[PDB]
């Protein structure tokens, strides 16, 4: 059904994201709750995989939207909540990538300082602050989304649009990506080939996942509706969102389950 | 005015 | 001159070997072959005494069978209310390198010692409310590896300097020094009737001592490496020994020789503890491989496993009434099983 | 020696305000819960207030709530406001450390006089005075509006002896356990709502008035108490 | 009543959590070494029948417990199992040759035994001045005990002290090489040897080595080494 | 030293060698009897019902 290549590829990527991320995040957070101790290294991974779990669990709304390919299947409250609920998980995950990169940099840049200050409660407090900052980053969409005509059945959507799009750009993707590439450059320059491999893969996956979302974000302001550019852009935008989501299924494998220790603990625990 | 938009934006 | 005494020592040891062989008419497995095995004796973690800072080295049950005193390298001895998992005392030690602790049968005193060589005695029932040292039993020339109370006044300690000692906690002096080992005496356990005790040592031989006489009565051998753990069978007439050779053995005193050995080709980790369940039908042993295994003490083969630890289990005490088995660990969790 | 000394009481006009104080030494004060218990000049004991170790929680009696206030440096304080005629009483500072096998109320202060110019568990006794003689044996009883057996199997009755003209002492705690230093002549029993304490081979040191107390839930209501008196 | 016991438990947990931070930030160190080694004089340099002589010292707001082991038997394979969570095992040797072979046997024993695989070894080659004088005066010839020294030569990348004559350079670098050979023979990298020659700076040297151990453990934990 | 030490060793070995002994069959027999005689009082080898088990 709905055989358009852009939408069907988007639904493929989304279904793959769900199918990989339910187990991917579920098993790692289950291990973190039972087999893995609540260390500082565990705290960032727990919060990250939890944000990714929220990303995955809320994705069936995106699948439903893709299948309906228009209008809105629920009420006004549903349309006001759903985007915020999904994208809070997304942006919290991105900020937690930033926080992990900063902490990795810190534990290589000033170990004496870490020995005096780095503890579980402090890190968890930072993660709570990041949840709050992400929540702040996502109430604009809550206030601004509304239902309208836009179609044979009432579609839902919304200066503010450019304002929040650019604000979310600068604070949720540019600052994260700049900080991350700086940290992963510095760590490699301190540490070597294995360090370089992990750092480059970690930056690459993040950029591949989140660049499409934002380039289409700004092009949505560049291109007017009811034009080829608008139509083709919004068509492929589903795939862009799908990539940004797939970040959430990749993250467990490229942070926590890299470690032979954590992955061995998983392989032992997940039996029965 | 108004424009419809997917969830992730 | 001396060669004569060497020859007599060798020939006397040969006499003992011959006599032990003469007594061996039927090894234990033969007579026990007919009984049904204990079966699938699986167990599950009911509680978990979370809270130590570092690796544990002892977890001993009080005579009430409900409090457990756990001692850890963090310099702490914590008394656990094992039904609720409340912590009723935290007892900060002088020297953090504890290696053993003990709970007096009255519950009045908690003993504890280690690389300091001083066996401390802590008093729990002080009028001032807070725990305090009652006596500090100085006198060994090596690490105090293991200790147990005979009664509220007398404590018996096994130390790295090859000796064991019967102290008097009122005077603080060694009322009797047991000697005869030729290595570190790494383990000890007083018999149920407190008339005698055994201590296993890194000469790979276990010795039975009577506290009323002051010398070893019997010497048992058969391990290929140091004996890390030892425990009396509840009848007070047999005891288990477990060694870094990854194998543990059952010795019968009246038989004067080893009767059964517990091993399986896939275990290579060194032992750390041994303890029977009250009937003597289950032998529990702790290992370096992070597991603790349950051995059918007479069918003489493995029957269950205790798991979930990140590191080696340091001690495997069983409650007096048998309702549970604790397992201290180097990952700081004291798992309680039933 | 373990020691408690309360101080600061005195004469007050009705409606007045004052601070009572408790001082401690010889024991790890900051790990003990501190109670206040008071006694009218011609009545049995009544519970007043409780402050737990580390100040984790505080309670007050239903007739005291808000008007008084408690705080704990080896000292404690008892704020008082709108002092009533009925607030006239001798006030005792009482220590209590709580853990499995612990012995709450094991030490009572000397006591300060202060003079002013239905959902509860309540206690009663079928007796108020009893003749006794040394060498003989005696008994007493106490009764409850609720069964004092908590779900854990302990019965939370407490027995106290007030020898004439001095601080009380703990005789038996949680309805069976004999407190330290108590002569072995005593014994006790508990049957859910009804409780007894017994003395075999009495000596004159045991003369006084006996108070039973429930500890299952606040407020800690005392019974009216039974006098055991010579000849 | 029982809830008061629960509060007691919470209080004990607060006490333990205040102790956790201190235990975590303070650094445990062992101090092995031969009786003729400078371990006693090193302990005298550092500043704030018993079996253990814990001493404590501080550098740059990092404080260390150096556990000089006291009256114990020489069968170390047991009381070493306690120390297998220190941050580094300081080993001190008399570089003056003969009993150097016993020092090398100690180092092998310390490096390879099964419980210490994650513990770095800081090796202070102490008494260096006495080695230098003994070589310079010809009182002993190292070839007498290490035949290789008759064929070995100074490294092309050595950095001796200015005014140091090549003989004692030969000697020092030989001895350090001989220990580092035992160090490298495990070929596993999971723990690293930090030899030094040696004052006032030994505390700073321990601090630098411990900084490196902590940094490498941080990299290993994050799977980013 | 060594002469007296060895004399003590041989005397100790004699004291041990003269100790009484029983055939291993008897030891095994009454060890078996003991373990069976408490099969009901020992709870670990009889997986405990939740009403009896105080850790449940």
Cα angle for residues C225, C227, C230 (degrees, 5° grid): 155
The residue of chain B with its CA nearest to that of A141 is B9
**DSSP state for residue C208 in the 8-state scheme:** E
| Helix/strand/coil for C179 | coil
Q: Which of residues 165-194 of D touch C (CB under 8 A)?
A: 180
Angle at the Cα of F34 from the Cα atoms of C201 and C231, rounded to 5 degrees: 15
Contact flag E52-C97 (C-beta cutoff 8 Å)? yes
List chain E domain ranges: 27-221
Compute the distance between CA of residue F48 and CA of residue A143 in angstroms, rounded to an integer: 58
Beta-carbon count within 10 A of D56 CB:
15
What the block records as the tokens of C311 is 């590191």
Strand-pair category, C109-114 with C98-103: antiparallel
User: DSSP strand E in E120-205: where?
Assistant: 120-126, 193-197
* Strands in E22-173 per DSSP E: 27-33, 52-59, 62-69, 88-94, 120-126
By C-alpha distance, the chain D residue nearest C125 is: D102
D107, containing H or E segment: strand D107-108
Strands D89-96 and D75-80, bridge-based pairing = unpaired
Q: How are beta strands D226-230 and D129-132 bridged, if at all?
A: parallel
Rounded to 5 degrees, φ, ψ at C161 are: -90, 25
CB-nearest partner of D32 from C67, C84, C129: C129
Cα–Cα distance between F40 and E128 in angstroms, integer?
A: 71
Residue C159 parent element (H or E):
strand C154-159
* CA angle, D131 then D137 then D143, to 5°: 70
Domain boundaries, chain F: 3-55
User: b/e for C18-47, b at 16 or more Cβ within 10 A?
Assistant: eebeebeeebbeebbeeeeebeebebeebb
Distant-in-sequence, close-in-space partners of E49: CB < 8 Å, separation ≥ 6: C117, C138, C139, C140, C141, E71
Work out the angle between the directed axes of helices A76-109 and A228-254 (0-180°, nearest 10).
50
Question: Chain C 32-71, CB below 8 Å of chain F: which residues?
Answer: 32, 35, 38, 41-43, 46-47
Q: Could you tell me the CA-to-CA distances from E118 to C333, D3, D129, E84, E218 in Å, in that order?
A: 22, 53, 76, 8, 13
Give the separation between CA A173 and CA A80, rounded to whole angstroms: 23
**Residues C155/C111, Cβ–Cβ less than 8 Å:** yes
Q: Which long-range contacts (CB under 8 A, 24 or more apart) does C195-199 make?
A: C197/C148, C197/C156, C197/C164, C198/C230, C198/C232, C198/C239, C199/C146, C199/C158, C199/C164, C199/C230
**CA–CA dist D48, D66 (Å, integer):** 12
Nearest to D100 among C88, C125, C127 (CB): C88
d(CA E129, CA E137): 12
Experiment used for this model: cryo-EM
Q: Give φ, ψ of A47 to 5 degrees.
A: -65, -40
Chain E interface includes D30 (CB < 8 A): no
Instruction: Using alpha carbons only, give the angle D223, D224, D226 rounded to the nearest 5 degrees.
Output: 105
According to DSSP, the residues that pair with A140 across neighbouring strands are: none
Collapsing DSSP to helix, strand or coil, C14 comes out as: helix
Q: How many CB atoms lie within 10 A of CB C306?
A: 22
Neighbouring C-alpha atoms within 13 Å toward the C-beta of E200: 0
Q: Distance (Å, rounded) from C-alpha A69 to C-alpha A71?
A: 7
Q: Please give the C-alpha separations between residue D116 and each of C253, D14, D38, D84, D86, in angstroms, as whole numbers.
A: 78, 6, 14, 7, 8
F-D interface (Cβ pairs under 8 Å ≥ 3): no
Chain centroid offset of residue C146 CA: 8
Contact with chain C for residue F14, Cβ under 8 A: yes
| Range D3-116 classified under CATH 2.60.40.10 | yes
Q: Which CATH class, in words, describes the domain spanning E27-221?
A: alpha beta
Cβ–Cβ gap E85/C73 under 8 Å: yes
Closest to D90 measured CA to CA, from D49, D37, D162: D37
Which one-letter DSSP state was computed for residue C182?
A: S
The token duo for C223 is 């391990």
CA distance C132 to C325: 29
For chain B, give me the number of helices (H) and strands (E)? 0, 0
Chain C CB contacts of F32 under 8 Å are: 31-32, 35, 298
Q: Give the distance between the most distant pair of CA atoms in chain D.
A: 50
- Write out the DSSP string of C25-93: SS-HHHHHTTSPP-------EEEEE---SS-EEEEEE-TTSSEEEEEETTTEEEEEETTTTEEEEEEE-
In angstroms, the CA D115 to CA D90 distance is 9
Domain locations in chain C? 1-338
Q: Using CA atoms, how far apart are residues C48 and C113, in angstroms rounded to an integer? A: 24
* E47 Cα to chain C: minimum distance (Å): 19
- Measured CA to CA, the distance from residue E219 to residue A199 in angstroms comes to 12
Kindly determine whether residue B7 and residue A87, on different chains, have CB atoms separated by under 8 Å.
yes
Q: Is E193:E90 a contact under the CB 8 Å cutoff?
A: no
Residues of C with CB under 8 A from a CB of D: 66-67, 81, 84, 86, 88-89, 107, 125, 127-130
Q: Is E52 on the interface with C (CB under 8 A)?
A: yes
Distance CA E195, CA E104 (A): 13
Q: What token pair was written down for C45?
A: 């973690």
How open is the CA angle A149-A155-A156, to the nearest 5 degrees?
A: 110
| Closest CB to D52 among E2, E7, E14 | E7
Hey, what CATH topology would domain C1-338 get? Answer: Methylamine Dehydrogenase; Chain H (2.130.10)
Beta strand residue intervals within chain A, DSSP E: 146-147, 156-157
Contact status of A119 with chain E (Cβ, < 8 Å): yes
Does residue C171 have a cis peptide bond before it, meaning omega lies within 30 degrees of 0?
no
**Cα separation of D116 and D88, whole Å?**
5
Task: Give CA–CA dist C185/C187, Å, rounded.
Answer: 6
Q: How far apart are CA C161 and CA C168, in angstroms?
A: 19
- Given resolution (angstroms): 3.6
Residue E10 with chain D: CB contacts under 8 Å: 54, 56
- Tokens of residue E186, six digits: 């495990």
What is the Cα–Cα distance from A31 to A37, expressed in whole angstroms? 9
Helix or strand or coil: residue E77?
coil
Residue in chain E lying closest to D215 (CA)? E1
> D1: exposed, middle or buried (C-beta count within 10 Å: 0-12, 13-18, 19+)?
exposed
Q: Which fold has domain F3-55?
A: G Protein Gi Gamma 2 (4.10.260)
d(CA A255, CA D231): 86
Domain(s) of CATH 2.60.40.10: residues in chain D: 3-116, 123-229
Give DSSP secondary structure letters for C236-305: SSEEEEEETTS-EEEEETTTTEEEEEE--TT--SPEEEEEE-TTSSEEEEEETTS-EEEEETTT-SEEEE
Question: What whole-number distance in Å separates Cα of residue A237 and Cα of residue D175?
Answer: 76
Provide the token pair at A74: 């629920």
The Cβ-side half-sphere exposure at D196, using a 13 Å CA radius, reads 7
Q: Are C310 and C278 in contact (CB under 8 A)?
A: no
**Contact call for residues C322 and C58 (beta carbons, < 8 A):** no
Which chain B residues touch A145 with a CB distance below 8 Å? 5
- E5's CB contacts (< 8 A; 6+ apart) are C81, C84, C86, C88, D98, D99, D100, D102
Minimal CA separation from C13 to chain F, in Å: 7
D163 DSSP β-pair partners: none
Give A 1-60 residues with CB within 8 A of chain B.
none
Cβ-count burial of A27 within 10 angstroms (0-12 exposed, 13-18 middle, 19+ buried)? middle
Structurally, what CATH architecture does the domain formed by A5-148+156-269 represent? Up-down Bundle (1.20)
Chain D hits for C127, CB-CB cut-off 8 Å, are: 2, 26-27, 180
The residues, ordered by sequence, that sit 6+ positions from A71 with a Cβ below 8 Å of its Cβ are A151, A152, A153, A154, A155, A156
CB D199 within 8 Å of CB D186: yes
Q: CATH homologous superfamily for D123-229?
A: Immunoglobulins (2.60.40.10)
Q: Indicate the SS3 state at residue E40.
A: helix
Straight-line distance from the first to the last Cα atom of chain D, in angstroms, rounded to the nearest whole number: 35
Among C89, C115, C226, the residue with its CB nearest the CB of E51 is: C115
Task: Compare CB distances from B7 to A65, A149, A217 and report the shortest one's residue.
Answer: A65
Strand order in the sheet with C144-149: C144-149, C154-159, C164-168, C174-178
The secondary structure of C103-153 as a DSSP string is E-TTSSEEEEEETT--EEEEESS-TTSS-EEEEEE---SS-EEEEEESSSS
Residues 6+ apart with CB under 8 A from E200: E45
């Amino acid at each position: 059904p709905w055989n358009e290549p852009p939408v069907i590829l988007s639904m493929v990527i989304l279904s793959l994201t769900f199918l990989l991320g339910l187990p991917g995040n579920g098993l790692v957070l289950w291990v973190a709750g039972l087999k893995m101790q609540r260390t500082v290294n565990t705290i960032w991974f727990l919060h990250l995989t939890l944000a990714d779990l929220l990303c995955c669990l809320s994705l069936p709304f995106s699948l439903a939207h893709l299948a309906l390919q228009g209008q809105w299947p629920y009420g006004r409250f549903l349309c006001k909540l759903i985007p915020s609920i999904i994208v809070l998980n997304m942006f919290a995950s991105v900020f937690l990538l930033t926080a992990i990169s900063l902490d990795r940099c810190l534990v290589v840049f000033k170990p004496i300082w870490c020995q005096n200050h780095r503890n579980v409660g402090m890190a968890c407090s930072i993660c709570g602050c990041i949840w709050v900052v992400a929540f702040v980053m996502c109430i604009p969409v809550f206030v601004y989304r509304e239902i309208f005509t836009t179609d044979n059945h009432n579609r839902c959507g919304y200066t503010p649009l450019v304002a929040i799009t650019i604000t979310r750009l600068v604070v949720g993707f540019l600052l994260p990506s700049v900080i991350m590439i700086a940290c992963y450059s510095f760590i490699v320059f301190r540490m070597q080939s294995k360090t370089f491999r992990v750092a480059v893969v970690v930056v690459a996956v993040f950029l591949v996942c989140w660049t499409p979302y934002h380039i289409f974000g700004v092009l949505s302001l560049l291109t007017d509706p009811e034009t080829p550019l608008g139509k083709t852009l919004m068509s492929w935008d589903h795939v862009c969102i799908a990539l940004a989501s797939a970040n959430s299924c990749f993250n467990p494998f490229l942070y926590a389950l890299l470690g032979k220790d954590f992955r061995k603990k998983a392989r032992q625990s997940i039996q029965g | 005015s108004f424009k419809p938009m997917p969830l992730x934006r | 001159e001396l060669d004569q005494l060497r020859q007599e020592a060798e020939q006397l040891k040969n006499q003992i070997r011959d006599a032990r062989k003469a007594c061996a008419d039927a090894t234990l497995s033969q007579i026990t072959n007919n009984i049904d095995p204990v079966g699938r004796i699986q167990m599950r973690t009911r509680r978990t005494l979370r809270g130590h800072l570092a690796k544990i080295y002892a977890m001993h049950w009080g005579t009430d069978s409900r409090l457990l005193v756990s001692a850890s390298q963090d310099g702490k001895l914590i008394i656990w209310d094992s039904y609720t998992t409340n912590k009723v005392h935290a007892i900060p030690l002088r020297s953090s390198w504890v290696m053993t602790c003990a709970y007096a049968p009255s519950g009045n005193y908690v003993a504890c010692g280690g690389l300091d060589n001083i066996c401390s005695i802590y008093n729990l029932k002080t009028r001032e409310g807070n725990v305090r040292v009652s006596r500090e039993l100085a006198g060994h020339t090596g690490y105090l590896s293991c200790c147990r109370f005979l009664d509220d006044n007398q404590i018996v300690t096994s130390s790295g300097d090859t000796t064991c000692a019967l102290w008097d906690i009122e005077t603080g002096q060694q009322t009797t020094t047991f000697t005869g080992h030729t290595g570190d005496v790494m383990s000890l356990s007083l018999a149920p009737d407190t008339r005698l005790f055994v201590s296993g040592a890194c000469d790979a031989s276990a010795k039975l001592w009577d506290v009323r006489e002051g010398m070893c009565r019997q010497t048992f051998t058969g391990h290929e490496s140091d004996i890390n753990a030892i425990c009396f069978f509840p009848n007070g007439n047999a005891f288990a020994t477990g060694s870094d050779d990854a194998t543990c053995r059952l010795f019968d005193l009246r038989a004067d020789q080893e009767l059964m050995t517990y091993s399986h080709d896939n275990i290579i980790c060194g032992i750390t503890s041994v303890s029977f369940s009250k009937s003597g039908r289950l032998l529990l042993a702790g290992y370096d491989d992070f597991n603790c295994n349950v051995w059918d003490a007479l069918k003489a083969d493995r029957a269950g496993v205790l798991a979930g630890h990140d590191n080696r289990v340091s001690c495997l005490g069983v409650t007096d009434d048998g309702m549970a088995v604790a397992t201290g660990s180097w990952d700081s969790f004291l798992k309680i099983w039933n | 020696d373990v020691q408690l000394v309360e101080s600061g009481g005195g004469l007050v006009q009705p409606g007045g305000s004052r601070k009572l104080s408790c001082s401690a030494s010889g024991f790890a004060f900051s790990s003990f819960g501190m109670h206040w218990v008071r006694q009218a000049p011609e009545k049995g004991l009544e519970w007043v207030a409780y402050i737990s170790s580390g100040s984790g929680t505080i309670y007050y009696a239903d007739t005291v709530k808000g008007r008084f206030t408690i705080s704990r440096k080896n000292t404690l304080f008892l704020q008082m406001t709108s002092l009533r005629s009925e607030d006239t009483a001798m006030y005792y500072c009482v220590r209590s450390i709580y853990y499995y096998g612990s012995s709450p109320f094991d030490f009572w202060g000397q006591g300060t006089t202060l003079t002013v110019s239905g959902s509860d568990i309540v206690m009663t006794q079928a007796t108020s005075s009893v003749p006794v003689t040394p060498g003989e044996s005696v008994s007493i009883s106490c009764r409850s509006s609720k069964s004092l057996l908590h779900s854990n199997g302990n019965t939370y009755l407490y027995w106290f002896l007030q020898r004439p003209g001095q601080s009380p002492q703990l005789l038996i705690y949680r309805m069976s356990n004999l407190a330290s230093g108590v002569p072995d002549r005593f014994s006790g029993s508990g049957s859910g709502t009804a409780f007894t304490l017994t003395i075999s081979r009495l000596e004159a040191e045991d003369v006084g008035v006996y108070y039973c107390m429930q500890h299952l839930e606040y407020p800690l209501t005392f019974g009216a108490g039974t006098k055991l008196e010579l000849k | 009543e029982d809830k008061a016991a629960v509060e007691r438990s919470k209080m004990i947990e607060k006490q333990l959590q205040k102790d956790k931070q201190v235990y975590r930030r303070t650094l445990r160190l062992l101090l092995l070494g031969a009786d003729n080694s400078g371990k006693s004089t090193i302990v005298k340099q550092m500043r704030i029948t018993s079996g253990i002589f814990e001493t404590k010292f501080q550098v740059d707001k990092v404080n260390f417990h150096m556990f000089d082991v006291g009256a114990q038997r020489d069968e170390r394979r047991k009381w070493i199992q306690c120390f297998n969570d220190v941050t580094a095992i300081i080993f001190v040797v008399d570089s003056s040759d003969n009993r150097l072979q016993e020092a090398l046997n100690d180092f092998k024993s310390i490096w390879n035994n099964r419980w210490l695989r994650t513990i770095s070894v800081i090796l202070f080659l102490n008494k260096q001045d006495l080695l230098a004088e003994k070589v310079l005066a010809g009182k002993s010839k190292i070839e007498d005990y290490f035949p290789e020294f008759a064929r070995y030569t100074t490294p092309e990348d050595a950095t001796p002290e200015p005014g140091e004559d090549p003989r004692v350079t030969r000697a020092k670098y030989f001895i350090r090489k001989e220990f580092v050979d035992i160090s490298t023979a495990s070929g596993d990298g999971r723990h690293i040897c930090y030899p030094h020659f040696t004052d006032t700076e030994n505390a700073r040297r321990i601090f630098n080595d411990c900084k490196d151990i902590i940094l490498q453990m941080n990299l290993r934990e994050y799977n980013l080494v | 030293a060594s002469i007296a030490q060895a004399r003590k060793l041989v005397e100790q070995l004699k004291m041990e060698a003269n100790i009484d002994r029983i055939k291993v069959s008897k030891a095994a027999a009454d060890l078996m009897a003991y373990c069976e005689a408490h099969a009901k009082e020992d709870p670990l080898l009889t997986p405990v019902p939740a009403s009896e088990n105080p850790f449940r």
